[PDB]
């Protein structure tokens, strides 16, 4: 049981590592997308100049 207990946990962490990496991709991508909605809001304002 202890071996099974251990070697299972090893995969679990590796799995979470597989999830953590992808989440980094998504967070960073999203962190970039907020700036893009600053971009649109600012750019329409420039477009909105009379």
């Amino acid at each position: 049981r202890l071996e099974y207990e251990i070697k299972t946990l090893e995969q679990v962490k590796e799995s979470t590592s597989r999830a953590q990496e992808m989440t980094q991709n998504s967070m960073k991508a999203l962190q970039d997308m907020v700036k893009l909605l600053e971009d649109f809001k600012v750019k329409v304002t420039q477009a909105a100049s009379d």
Binding site: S17, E21, Q24, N25, K28
Partner: protein, 50 residues
Amino acid sequence: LSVNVQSIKSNVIDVDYGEAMMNLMQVQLAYQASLKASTTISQLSLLNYM
């Protein structure tokens, strides 16, 4: 993006240099300790018949 792939690339492949090094040492020297133990026993086994 590529750096993340490289990061993922590195995460996937590179061994834990320390853990394995000392873990290898762990198994290695105990193996070596056994190696002499085998040798001594040869002399210890062979001596008795005289």
